[PDB]
Design a protein around this ligand. Structure first.
Ligand SMILES: O=c1ccn([C@@H]2O[C@H](COP(=O)(O)OP(=O)(O)O)[C@@H](O)[C@H]2O)c(=O)[nH]1
Ligand SMILES: O=c1ccn([C@@H]2O[C@H](COP(=O)(O)OP(=O)(O)O)[C@@H](O)[C@H]2O)c(=O)[nH]1
Ligand SMILES: CC(=O)N[C@@H]1[C@@H](O)[C@H](O)[C@@H](CO)O[C@H]1O
Ligand SMILES: CC(=O)N[C@@H]1[C@@H](O)[C@H](O)[C@@H](CO)O[C@H]1O
Ligand SMILES: *[C@H]1O[C@H](CO)[C@@H](O)[C@H](O)[C@H]1NC(C)=O
Ligand SMILES: *[C@H]1O[C@H](CO)[C@@H](O)[C@H](O)[C@H]1NC(C)=O
Ligand SMILES: *[C@H]1O[C@H](CO)[C@@H](O)[C@H](O)[C@H]1NC(C)=O
Lengths: 500, 6, 500, 8
C-alpha cells in the first residue's frame, strides 16, 4: 500500500510547498511507510532538480510515465559539437557570451543550439528554421539526454502543437493548442498507451486518467497543489481516497473569516469537499477557522509542514564586531522585503556594521536591487540568491525578519529557531503566532507597524544579553516540532484515515 | 537575428 | 545497370506521356534490359493506378522510397468499424449518402472517417477534432492499408506541416508550409534516412537527393516529365547521365522556329542543355527543328514513342448499314474537336446513317455537348468518355479523324493505323505527315482547312473500295513502327549513349 | 449546416 503526495513539479529553486512534500517523504521514510511524490507537469529538468533532495525512485512524473522514462537514469554523455562537425560536416559559429551555437550547412542557416553548461555536455534545446528563417520547430532535450518534446510553431513563434517522445523517438503524446487572450491553451491531447490511443480535452482529464493507472486497492493520495490536483481528483471515482492539504491561508481576505470567498487556488477543493477524506492544515488556528467555515462537513486536522532535527553545523558563532540580520523569503510582493531595506536604511545610522542577507528568488529581484542602489546600501544589504543548503548561513545570524502579510506556517521561521536564530515577525495568520512567544524566542509585531519593527529590532541589537536569551528560547520552541513528534502525528493519521 | 534564440 | 524512366505520377486514365513511358518499359523488357519507371509525387493511390499496366517491381516512387514502402503490396483489409466499436468502445453514426462515419467517445465527437469503397474495406482519410470542433489533423491512408501522411491544420483548415510514415508508424519525412498567394508552399523538408537527418528547402532538392540515392555507376536516367524532372537533374552531378525526352512541340508558337520562346515545361531543360547526354524526340522533323534551334549543342535523335503489335481482336468488321467515324483524343482545346462536330453537321444531310464516336476526357466536354445539342446531333455524335480498352471500338471503325493543331507524335494515330483504320489528319507538327502517306493509308489536309476536310471524308464515304485500300495500307505503314523496329533503335541508342 | 465542415 503506497502513499502518494501529488504536487506539480520541482523547480530549480524549491518553493515552500515543494519543500513540505519533501519533508513528508522523509518523515514517511524514517517511519518505514512507503511514499512517493507524484508530479504532474512536463519538466525535462526534473531529474536534475530532484537530485539534491530525493532519489529517482521516490517520484513518478506523469509525462515520464507515458514517455516510458519513469525511473530512467542519466545517459552516457554524448558529444553533439563533434557529431555536428565531424559526422555531419556542419560549421558552427559560437554566440558571444552564451552556451549557444548557430549551425550552417551548404551556406544555409539550419539550426540554433543552446546548451545548459560551459563544457557543452547538456544539450538543452535546438531551434530549426526554414528557407526564410522562420522558426518552424523547437526540439527540447531532457537533461538525461533524450529528445523529450518537439513544438511546432505558427505565425509569431506561437505554439501550435507539441509531440512527446520516449527515449527511442517513438511519439507518445500529442497536444494541440489554441490562443485565448494571448496565452496558449490545450484543446486536445492524444496519448498512445497500452497499445491503444486515448483522447482528452485538457490536462485535467489526462491527470485523472494517470491517477487511475497508478491506483491499487489500498493506496492513499494527498492533494498538495490544489489548483491543479483537486480538479483532477474531482474526476476520479470516490473509491480512490484522497486528502486535501492546504498550504496557505484559505480565504482571500483573511479578516472576513465568515464571508470572504475562498482563494481561487482552493475553490474546486472547497466546492466538492465530500470527495476528500480530510483537510490537513499546518496550524491550530487554521484548523479552527476552516472547520467552522465548512460547518464540519469533513474532518480537519493540523500537522505542521516543517520539523526540526538536531544540527551538526555550528550554532550561534557570532562575529562580535558586525551584526548579521537575515531574511529567508521569496523575492515576491507579499513578503514585502522592501520594508526590510527601509528598516536597514534607518538602522545604519546607529549600527555602522550592520548587514542584512536576503536569501530567495523571484520577481521583485530587480525592484529590490534598484531600491538598495538608490539608497547606497550595497555594502549592507545583499540579495544572496537561493542557496540549496542554508546551514552555514544561520551559524552567525543574529536575528531573522519576517515582514509578510500571509503565511501557512513558514518553514523558514521554524528553520531559524531550530538553528538558534530568534525571529521578529509581524503577527499574521498563520504560523508566527504559534511559533513565536513574544519575549521568549522573538517578538510579534502588529502587521505593517514599521515603527515598532524598528524599535524591537534595535532593542535586541542594543542588548546582546537579550539576543542570547531568545536564542536559547529558540532552540526550545523548535524542540516541540521535532522529527519525532511529527512522525507520531503522521503515523496516527495514516492509521485512521481509511475506512476499516 | 535576435528571434533565433529563446 | 538499370535504366530509369522518370515521370511524375499515374492517374486513373492513362495519358500519352505515361503510355510512352510504359511502352518504353515494355520494349526494354522484350530485349532483356533492366528498366523501371520512377514517379516523384506523393500518391497513396498509385499502387492501384499502376496495377492495371505495370507490376510493383516495375516502378519506384520517391515517397514510397523514403517511407520504406517500395515494392510493398496490399494488406488483407483491416475491419476498422469492428475495431472502433468492439475494441475501442466508440460509437459510430453513419453519414447518410456516403461511406462516412462520425466517431464518438460516449457522446464526445472525436473523428470523421471517410472510406473509399461502399464495402468499408479501404479507409481513405480520418479527420481529428479538438474540444471546440476545430479540425486539427487529417490522416491520409495509402490504398495498401498503412497510414501514409498526417497533415496539421491551422486557422481556416490551412496546411501548416505534414508528416510521412513508414508502414510501421515511424516518421520518415516532415514538410513545413507557408502560404503565398493563397496556396501552401513547402519552405522546409526534413528526411530521416540512413540513420541521418537531411534538410532541404523544397521538393526539387529532395528529388535531387533521391536521384543520387538511386544511382549506381552505369545506370542511365531518362527525363520524361521535364517541368519537374529537369530542375531535379540540374541539381545532380554531371557524373549521373540523363537523357531528356520531349513529348510535344518544344516552342510556344511552332510557326516561329527561330524566335519563339520554349514552352514553360521545357525552359529549365533548354537553359541547361549541357547537363544532358542527348535529346530524344519522336519525329524526324522535330529532330531537325530542334538541332537547328539549339545550334547542335548536344545530340538530337528521333525514336517514336509508340509501336504496334499485331492484333488478335477483329479488324474491319464493318456494319454495312452505317458509317462509323472515330476520334480518339482528349476533350481539350488543341484537339479542336468542335471542328469534327461541324463536319458531322454538314455530312448528316448527305449521309444520314453516320456516327461519330469520340473517346477521351477533359474540360471541353461541356462545350462539346452543348454544341451537339445546338445542332440536334445527339443521334449522331457520341461523347463516349475514356475507355481503357479500345480494341473492340476499332473493329467497326471506317475512318479516324485528327483535327489537332499540335502533336508530338500522336499515339492514337499509330494505334488507329495498327487496327487497320485509315486516318484523315491535318498536316501539323509533329507526326501526321510521317505516319500518313496521302492516298496510301489516309489523307493529310492543310491545317484548319475544314472544306478540304469535308471533301476528302466525303470522298472515302462515297468509295468504300478506296477505304478498303487505305485500310490495308494502314496495316502496312503500322509495320514500319513494329515492336522489333523500335527495339532495334533503342538497343543501338543505349549502347552508344554512355561515355568512354 | 455547420456539420458539413466535418468532411473534406
Ligand atoms: O536561499 C534559500 C531561500 C529559501 N529556501 C527555502 O525555501 C523554503 C521557503 O519556506 P516557506 O515556508 O517560508 O515558503 P514560502 O512561504 O516562501 O512559500 C524554506 O524551506 C527555505 O529553507 C532555501 O532553501 N534557500
Ligand atoms: O478513350 C480513350 C482515349 C484515349 N486513350 C489513350 O490516350 C492516349 C492519348 O495519347 P496521344 O498521343 O494520342 O494524345 P496526347 O493525349 O498524348 O496528346 C492514346 O494512347 C490512347 O490510346 C485511351 O486509352 N482511351
Ligand atoms: C505565502 C504562504 O502562505 N506561504 C506558505 C508557507 O507559509 C508554507 O510554510 C508553505 C508550506 O506549507 O506553503 C506556502 O504556500
Ligand atoms: C498535345 C501533344 O503534344 N501531344 C503529345 C502526343 O503527340 C505524344 O504522343 C505524347 C507522347 O509522346 O505526348 C503528348 O504530349
Ligand atoms: C536569445 O539569446 C541571445 C543570446 O544568446 C540574445 O541575443 C537574444 O536576445 C535572446 N532572445 C530572447 C531572449 O528571446
Ligand atoms: C453537426 O455538427 C454541429 C456542429 O458543427 C452540431 O451542432 C450538430 O449536432 C452535428 N450534427 C450531427 C448530425 O452530428
Ligand atoms: C463533406 O462530406 C459530407 C458527406 O458526403 C457531406 O455531408 C458534407 O456536405 C460535405 N461537405 C463538403 C462539401 O465539404
Amino acid at each position: 500500500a503506497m502513499n502518494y503526495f501529488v504536487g506539480n513539479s520541482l523547480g530549480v529553486n524549491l518553493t515552500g510547498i515543494e519543500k513540505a512534500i519533501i519533508n513528508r517523504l522523509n518523515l514517511f521514510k524514517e517511519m518505514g511507510r512507503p511514499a512517493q511524490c507524484v508530479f504532474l507537469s512536463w519538466n525535462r529538468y526534473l531529474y536534475r532538480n530532484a537530485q539534491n533532495y530525493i532519489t529517482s525512485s521516490d517520484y513518478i512524473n506523469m509525462y515520464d510515465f507515458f514517455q516510458e522514462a519513469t525511473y530512467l537514469e542519466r545517459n552516457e554523455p554524448f558529444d553533439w559539437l563533434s557529431y555536428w562537425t565531424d559526422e555531419c560536416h556542419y560549421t558552427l559559429k559560437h554566440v558571444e557570451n552564451s552556451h549557444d551555437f548557430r549551425i550552417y550547412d551548404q551556406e544555409r542557416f539550419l539550426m540554433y543550439a543552446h546548451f545548459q553548461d560551459p563544457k557543452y555536455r547538456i544539450l538543452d534545446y535546438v531551434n530549426h528554421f526554414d528557407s526564410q528563417r522562420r522558426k518552424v520547430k523547437r526540439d527540447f532535450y531532457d537533461v538525461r539526454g533524450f529528445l523529450s518534446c518537439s513544438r511546432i510553431l505558427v505565425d509569431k513563434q506561437q505554439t501550435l502543437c507539441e509531440f512527446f517522445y520516449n527515449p527511442e523517438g517513438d511519439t507518445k503524446l500529442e497536444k494541440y493548442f489554441s490562443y485565448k487572450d494571448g496565452k496558449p491553451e490545450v484543446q486536445k491531447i492524444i496519448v498512445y498507451y497500452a497499445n491503444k490511443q486515448y483522447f482528452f480535452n485538457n490536462e485535467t482529464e489526462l491527470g485523472a486518467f494517470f491517477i487511475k493507472q497508478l491506483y491499487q486497492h489500498g493506496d492513499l493520495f494527498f492533494s498538495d497543489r490544489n489548483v491543479y490536483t483537486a480538479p483532477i481528483f474531482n474526476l476520479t471515482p470516490e473509491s480512490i481516497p484522497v486528502v486535501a492539504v492546504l498550504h496557505s491561508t484559505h480565504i482571500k481576505n483573511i479578516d472576513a473569516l465568515d464571508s470572504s470567498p475562498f482563494k481561487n487556488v482552493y475553490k474546486a477543493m472547497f466546492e466538492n469537499l465530500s470527495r476528500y477524506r480530510a483537510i490537513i492544515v499546518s496550524t491550530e488556528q487554521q484548523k479552527l477557522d476552516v472547520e467552522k467555515r465548512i460547518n464540519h462537513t469533513i474532518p480537519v486536522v493540523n500537522i505542521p509542514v516543517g520539523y526540526s532535527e538536531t544540527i551538526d553545523t555550528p550554532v550561534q558563532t557570532l562575529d562580535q564586531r558586525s551584526v548579521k540580520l537575515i531574511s529567508v523569503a521569496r523575492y515576491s510582493p507579499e513578503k514585502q522585503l522592501h520594508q526590510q531595506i527601509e528598516l536597514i536604511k534607518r538602522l545604519v545610522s546607529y549600527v555602522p556594521k550592520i548587514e542584512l542577507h536576503m536569501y530567495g528568488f523571484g520577481s521583485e529581484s530587480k525592484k529590490l536591487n534598484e531600491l538598495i542602489q538608490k539608497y547606497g546600501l550595497e555594502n549592507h544589504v545583499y540579495l544572496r540568491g537561493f542557496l540549496s543548503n542554508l546551514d552555514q548561513e544561520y551559524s552567525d545570524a543574529y536575528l531573522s525578519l519576517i515582514t509578510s502579510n500571509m503565511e501557512g506556517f513558514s518553514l523558514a521561521l521554524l528553520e531559524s529557531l531550530a538553528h538558534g536564530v530568534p525571529v521578529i515577525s509581524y503577527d499574521i495568520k498563520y504560523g508566527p503566532n504559534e511559533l513565536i512567544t513574544s519575549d521568549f524566542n522573538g517578538y510579534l509585531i502588529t502587521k505593517n507597524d514599521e515603527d515598532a519593527l524598528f524599535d524591537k529590532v534595535k532593542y535586541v541589537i542594543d542588548h546582546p544579553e537579550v539576543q542570547q536569551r531568545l536564542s536559547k528560547g529558540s532552540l526550545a520552541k523548535a524542540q516541540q516540532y521535532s522529527k519525532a513528534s511529527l512522525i507520531k502525528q503522521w503515523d496516527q493519521f495514516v492509521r485512521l484515515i481509511l475506512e476499516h | 537575428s535576435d528571434s533565433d534564440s529563446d
